[PDB]
Design a protein around this ligand. Structure first.
Ligand SMILES: O=C(N[C@H](Cc1c[nH]c2ccccc12)C(=O)O)c1nc(Cl)c2ccccc2c1O
Ligand SMILES: [F-]
Ligand SMILES: [F-]
Ligand SMILES: [Zn+2]
Ligand SMILES: [Zn+2]
Length: 231
Protein backbone atom coordinates (compact mmCIF):
# COMPACT_ATOMS: atom_id res chain seq x y z
CA UNK A 1 2.55 -2.64 -0.91
CA UNK A 2 0.00 0.00 0.00
CA UNK A 3 1.08 3.61 -0.42
CA UNK A 4 3.00 4.58 2.72
CA UNK A 5 1.55 7.23 5.01
CA UNK A 6 3.18 9.65 7.40
CA UNK A 7 3.06 7.40 10.48
CA UNK A 8 4.74 4.55 8.59
CA UNK A 9 7.93 6.47 7.68
CA UNK A 10 10.30 7.64 10.45
CA UNK A 11 11.91 10.99 9.71
CA UNK A 12 15.19 10.12 8.02
CA UNK A 13 13.97 7.06 6.08
CA UNK A 14 12.78 6.96 2.46
CA UNK A 15 10.39 4.56 0.76
CA UNK A 16 9.99 3.91 -2.96
CA UNK A 17 6.65 3.02 -4.56
CA UNK A 18 6.37 1.62 -8.08
CA UNK A 19 3.81 3.59 -10.08
CA UNK A 20 4.39 2.10 -13.53
CA UNK A 21 7.11 0.39 -15.52
CA UNK A 22 10.15 2.60 -15.00
CA UNK A 23 8.31 5.11 -12.78
CA UNK A 24 8.47 5.30 -8.99
CA UNK A 25 7.54 7.82 -6.39
CA UNK A 26 9.80 8.48 -3.43
CA UNK A 27 8.24 9.17 -0.04
CA UNK A 28 9.90 10.83 2.93
CA UNK A 29 8.78 12.65 6.08
CA UNK A 30 9.98 15.86 7.68
CA UNK A 31 9.24 18.10 10.60
CA UNK A 32 8.22 21.68 9.73
CA UNK A 33 7.00 24.29 12.22
CA UNK A 34 6.38 21.55 14.75
CA UNK A 35 4.35 19.15 12.62
CA UNK A 36 5.46 16.11 10.59
CA UNK A 37 4.37 15.76 6.97
CA UNK A 38 4.96 13.14 4.27
CA UNK A 39 6.31 14.32 0.94
CA UNK A 40 6.59 12.76 -2.54
CA UNK A 41 8.91 13.05 -5.49
CA UNK A 42 9.38 11.05 -8.68
CA UNK A 43 11.99 8.75 -10.24
CA UNK A 44 11.85 7.98 -13.97
CA UNK A 45 14.04 5.49 -15.77
CA UNK A 46 15.87 6.78 -18.84
CA UNK A 47 17.69 3.85 -20.36
CA UNK A 48 20.41 2.80 -17.92
CA UNK A 49 20.16 6.02 -15.88
CA UNK A 50 17.53 7.69 -13.71
CA UNK A 51 15.97 11.14 -13.69
CA UNK A 52 14.99 12.38 -10.22
CA UNK A 53 12.16 14.86 -9.64
CA UNK A 54 12.50 16.72 -6.33
CA UNK A 55 14.63 16.06 -3.27
CA UNK A 56 13.39 14.14 -0.23
CA UNK A 57 13.06 17.30 1.93
CA UNK A 58 16.46 17.73 3.50
CA UNK A 59 20.07 16.63 3.33
CA UNK A 60 19.80 13.51 5.46
CA UNK A 61 16.59 12.36 3.77
CA UNK A 62 18.13 12.94 0.33
CA UNK A 63 21.21 10.89 1.25
CA UNK A 64 18.82 8.15 2.37
CA UNK A 65 16.97 8.51 -0.95
CA UNK A 66 20.15 7.89 -2.94
CA UNK A 67 20.92 4.83 -0.81
CA UNK A 68 17.40 3.45 -1.28
CA UNK A 69 17.60 3.95 -5.04
CA UNK A 70 20.90 2.14 -5.21
CA UNK A 71 19.51 -0.76 -3.16
CA UNK A 72 16.14 -1.09 -4.91
CA UNK A 73 16.84 0.01 -8.49
CA UNK A 74 20.62 -0.15 -8.94
CA UNK A 75 20.86 2.51 -11.67
CA UNK A 76 22.58 5.88 -11.22
CA UNK A 77 20.69 9.13 -10.80
CA UNK A 78 22.31 11.42 -13.34
CA UNK A 79 20.00 14.44 -13.37
CA UNK A 80 17.45 15.99 -11.03
CA UNK A 81 14.79 18.66 -11.49
CA UNK A 82 13.31 20.64 -8.59
CA UNK A 83 9.73 21.74 -9.23
CA UNK A 84 9.64 24.80 -6.92
CA UNK A 85 11.93 26.67 -4.55
CA UNK A 86 10.68 25.37 -1.18
CA UNK A 87 12.87 23.10 0.95
CA UNK A 88 10.77 19.98 0.27
CA UNK A 89 11.90 20.32 -3.37
CA UNK A 90 15.46 21.75 -3.14
CA UNK A 91 16.59 20.76 0.35
CA UNK A 92 19.16 18.10 -0.47
CA UNK A 93 20.32 19.62 -3.74
CA UNK A 94 23.83 19.98 -2.31
CA UNK A 95 23.90 16.25 -1.46
CA UNK A 96 22.81 15.49 -5.04
CA UNK A 97 25.36 17.82 -6.64
CA UNK A 98 28.25 16.48 -4.58
CA UNK A 99 27.21 12.93 -5.54
CA UNK A 100 27.62 13.86 -9.22
CA UNK A 101 23.95 14.51 -10.05
CA UNK A 102 23.38 17.45 -12.39
CA UNK A 103 20.67 19.55 -10.73
CA UNK A 104 18.22 21.74 -12.63
CA UNK A 105 15.40 24.20 -11.99
CA UNK A 106 13.80 27.13 -13.78
CA UNK A 107 15.50 30.53 -13.45
CA UNK A 108 12.56 31.66 -11.35
CA UNK A 109 12.99 28.75 -8.93
CA UNK A 110 16.73 29.41 -8.69
CA UNK A 111 16.24 33.10 -7.89
CA UNK A 112 13.57 32.38 -5.29
CA UNK A 113 15.67 29.65 -3.68
CA UNK A 114 18.63 32.00 -3.44
CA UNK A 115 16.50 34.75 -1.88
CA UNK A 116 15.02 32.30 0.65
CA UNK A 117 18.40 30.95 1.67
CA UNK A 118 17.59 27.52 0.29
CA UNK A 119 19.89 25.27 -1.72
CA UNK A 120 20.17 26.24 -5.38
CA UNK A 121 20.04 23.82 -8.34
CA UNK A 122 23.06 24.28 -10.61
CA UNK A 123 21.51 24.58 -14.08
CA UNK A 124 18.66 26.70 -15.41
CA UNK A 125 15.67 25.31 -17.33
CA UNK A 126 14.65 27.81 -19.99
CA UNK A 127 11.45 27.72 -21.98
CA UNK A 128 9.12 27.56 -18.97
CA UNK A 129 8.46 31.20 -18.05
CA UNK A 130 4.95 31.52 -19.50
CA UNK A 131 1.87 29.65 -18.34
CA UNK A 132 1.20 26.71 -20.64
CA UNK A 133 4.87 26.27 -21.58
CA UNK A 134 6.12 22.72 -21.96
CA UNK A 135 9.61 21.36 -22.59
CA UNK A 136 11.06 17.88 -22.95
CA UNK A 137 13.67 16.74 -20.44
CA UNK A 138 14.84 13.16 -20.81
CA UNK A 139 11.86 10.80 -20.43
CA UNK A 140 9.47 13.48 -19.15
CA UNK A 141 7.70 16.64 -20.17
CA UNK A 142 8.00 19.62 -17.83
CA UNK A 143 4.98 21.94 -17.80
CA UNK A 144 4.50 25.37 -16.24
CA UNK A 145 0.78 25.67 -15.46
CA UNK A 146 0.87 29.17 -14.02
CA UNK A 147 1.01 30.36 -10.45
CA UNK A 148 -0.55 28.08 -7.88
CA UNK A 149 1.08 26.90 -4.68
CA UNK A 150 3.98 29.13 -5.73
CA UNK A 151 4.65 31.33 -8.73
CA UNK A 152 7.36 28.98 -10.00
CA UNK A 153 5.73 25.58 -9.55
CA UNK A 154 6.23 23.03 -12.34
CA UNK A 155 4.42 19.78 -13.03
CA UNK A 156 5.88 16.72 -14.74
CA UNK A 157 4.27 14.27 -17.14
CA UNK A 158 5.65 10.84 -18.09
CA UNK A 159 4.13 10.23 -21.55
CA UNK A 160 5.12 6.56 -21.75
CA UNK A 161 3.09 5.78 -18.61
CA UNK A 162 0.45 8.56 -18.55
CA UNK A 163 1.68 9.56 -15.09
CA UNK A 164 1.12 13.16 -13.99
CA UNK A 165 3.26 14.36 -11.10
CA UNK A 166 1.59 17.52 -9.90
CA UNK A 167 3.98 18.47 -7.15
CA UNK A 168 2.62 21.00 -4.72
CA UNK A 169 0.25 22.54 -7.28
CA UNK A 170 -1.89 19.42 -6.72
CA UNK A 171 -3.39 18.40 -3.39
CA UNK A 172 -4.23 14.90 -2.18
CA UNK A 173 -7.90 13.92 -1.88
CA UNK A 174 -7.66 13.91 1.92
CA UNK A 175 -6.50 17.54 2.05
CA UNK A 176 -8.99 20.03 3.48
CA UNK A 177 -6.67 23.05 3.55
CA UNK A 178 -4.42 24.73 1.01
CA UNK A 179 -1.72 24.56 3.70
CA UNK A 180 1.20 26.99 3.43
CA UNK A 181 -0.23 29.78 1.25
CA UNK A 182 2.41 32.43 2.00
CA UNK A 183 3.79 32.10 -1.54
CA UNK A 184 0.58 30.97 -3.23
CA UNK A 185 -1.68 32.70 -5.76
CA UNK A 186 -5.13 31.57 -4.66
CA UNK A 187 -6.86 33.63 -7.36
CA UNK A 188 -4.86 32.02 -10.19
CA UNK A 189 -4.50 28.51 -8.78
CA UNK A 190 -7.85 27.18 -10.09
CA UNK A 191 -7.01 28.48 -13.58
CA UNK A 192 -3.57 26.85 -13.39
CA UNK A 193 -5.27 23.57 -12.44
CA UNK A 194 -7.63 23.95 -15.40
CA UNK A 195 -4.58 24.35 -17.66
CA UNK A 196 -3.25 21.04 -16.31
CA UNK A 197 -6.65 19.39 -16.82
CA UNK A 198 -6.80 20.58 -20.43
CA UNK A 199 -3.21 19.68 -21.28
CA UNK A 200 -3.16 16.15 -19.77
CA UNK A 201 -6.66 14.68 -20.23
CA UNK A 202 -5.19 11.17 -20.65
CA UNK A 203 -3.38 11.07 -17.29
CA UNK A 204 -4.06 7.77 -15.52
CA UNK A 205 -2.33 8.50 -12.21
CA UNK A 206 -1.94 11.89 -10.52
CA UNK A 207 0.68 12.23 -7.78
CA UNK A 208 0.41 15.20 -5.36
CA UNK A 209 3.38 16.80 -3.63
CA UNK A 210 2.20 15.36 -0.31
CA UNK A 211 -0.04 12.35 0.31
CA UNK A 212 -1.61 9.58 -1.70
CA UNK A 213 -1.70 9.38 -5.51
CA UNK A 214 -5.07 8.97 -7.18
CA UNK A 215 -6.76 9.68 -10.46
CA UNK A 216 -7.83 12.86 -12.22
CA UNK A 217 -10.15 13.71 -9.30
CA UNK A 218 -7.12 15.20 -7.51
CA UNK A 219 -7.09 18.09 -10.00
CA UNK A 220 -10.69 19.18 -9.47
CA UNK A 221 -10.36 18.54 -5.75
CA UNK A 222 -7.40 20.92 -5.66
CA UNK A 223 -9.34 23.69 -7.37
CA UNK A 224 -12.22 23.13 -4.93
CA UNK A 225 -10.04 23.27 -1.80
CA UNK A 226 -8.21 26.39 -2.88
CA UNK A 227 -11.42 28.14 -3.92
CA UNK A 228 -13.12 27.21 -0.63
CA UNK A 229 -10.08 28.53 1.25
CA UNK A 230 -10.13 31.81 -0.68
CA UNK A 231 -13.89 32.13 -0.13
O1 LIG B 1 -2.74 21.74 6.83
C1 LIG B 1 -2.19 20.98 6.10
N1 LIG B 1 -2.73 19.69 5.78
C2 LIG B 1 -3.97 19.27 6.34
C3 LIG B 1 -3.71 17.82 6.80
C4 LIG B 1 -3.61 16.78 5.69
C5 LIG B 1 -4.66 16.06 5.15
N2 LIG B 1 -4.22 15.24 4.21
C6 LIG B 1 -2.89 15.36 4.11
C7 LIG B 1 -1.98 14.71 3.26
C8 LIG B 1 -0.64 15.03 3.34
C9 LIG B 1 -0.20 15.99 4.26
C10 LIG B 1 -1.10 16.64 5.10
C11 LIG B 1 -2.46 16.32 5.02
C12 LIG B 1 -5.19 19.37 5.45
O2 LIG B 1 -5.13 19.83 4.29
O3 LIG B 1 -6.29 19.01 5.93
C13 LIG B 1 -0.78 21.18 5.59
N3 LIG B 1 -0.28 20.24 4.82
C14 LIG B 1 0.97 20.30 4.40
CL1 LIG B 1 1.52 19.03 3.32
C15 LIG B 1 1.84 21.35 4.80
C16 LIG B 1 3.18 21.42 4.36
C17 LIG B 1 4.00 22.46 4.77
C18 LIG B 1 3.52 23.45 5.61
C19 LIG B 1 2.20 23.39 6.05
C20 LIG B 1 1.36 22.33 5.62
C21 LIG B 1 0.02 22.21 6.05
O4 LIG B 1 -0.50 23.19 6.86
F1 LIG C 1 6.13 23.06 -0.46
F1 LIG D 1 5.88 21.45 -4.18
ZN1 LIG E 1 5.99 24.45 -1.46
ZN1 LIG F 1 -1.94 23.04 8.07
Amino acid sequence: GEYPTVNEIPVGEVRLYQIADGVWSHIATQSFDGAVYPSNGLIVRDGDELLLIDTAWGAKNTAALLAEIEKQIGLPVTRAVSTHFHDDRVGGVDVLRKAGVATYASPSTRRLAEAEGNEIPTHSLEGLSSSGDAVRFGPVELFYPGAAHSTDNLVVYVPSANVLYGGCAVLALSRTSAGNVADADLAEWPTSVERIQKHYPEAEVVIPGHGLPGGLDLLQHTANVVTAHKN
